[PDB]
């Protein structure tokens, strides 16, 4: 709206959200308001590079790299599968035995288990690996 009350609808951003989840997953601070203020200055969502820097600014380690689904089982989970369409999601586990993939839906704020055909249909090859000074292993949910 525009009447000195809302100005601009807080259009949710899966990217920023994922950052929050990952930031919170690592127990690292994250101010989406400030994040968007620093990286989403455009107000159109956190960019790949802007998002990566968003996590770094939080004293949180992150790095986008082109990996293969077969590698996601060895990458730093939970990992963030960057989606050029903005419909990203956080990979937390992969059931190669069943070809399924456990991801965190940034829309519903809940985990989900996709099928290879599904994950493959969504995966692009570029994933963002996150790490924290205190958590540089990823496997926090032993």
Swiss-Prot record:
Ranges where the Peptidase C39 domain occurs: 8-130
Entry annotation: catalytic residues: 88
Localisation per UniProt entry: Cell inner membrane
Family: Belongs to the ABC transporter superfamily. Protein-1 exporter (TC 3.A.1.109) family.
Additional observations: The complex HlyBD-TolC (OMF) forms a single transport channel across the two membranes, allowing direct export of alpha-hemolysin. These channel is involved in type 1 secretion system.
UniProt function note: Part of the ABC transporter complex HlyBD involved in hemolysin export. Transmembrane domains (TMD) form a pore in the inner membrane and the ATP-binding domain (NBD) is responsible for energy generation.
Notes on the domains: In HlyB the peptidase C39 domain, the ATP-binding domain (NBD) and the transmembrane domain (TMD) are fused.
Subunit structure: Homodimer.
Identification of the protein by name: Alpha-hemolysin translocation ATP-binding protein HlyB
Gene name of the encoded protein: hlyB
Parent-protein residues present: 2 to 137 of 707
């Amino acid at each position: 709206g525009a009447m000195a009350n809302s100005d601009s609808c807080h259009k949710i951003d899966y990217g920023l959200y994922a950052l929050e989840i990952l930031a919170q997953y690592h127990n690292v601070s994250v101010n989406p308001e400030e994040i968007k203020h620093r990286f989403d200055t455009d107000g159109t969502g956190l960019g790949l590079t802007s998002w990566l820097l968003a996590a770094k600014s939080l004293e949180l380690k992150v790095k986008q790299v082109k990996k293969t689904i077969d590698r996601l089982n060895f990458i730093s989970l939970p990992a963030l599968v960057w989606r050029e369409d903005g419909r990203h999601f956080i990979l937390t586990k992969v059931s190669k035995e069943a070809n399924r993939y456990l991801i965190f839906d940034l829309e519903q704020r809940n985990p989900r288990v996709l099928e290879q055909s599904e994950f493959e249909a969504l995966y692009q090859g570029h994933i963002i690996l996150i790490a924290s000074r205190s958590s540089v292993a990823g496997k926090l949910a032993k």
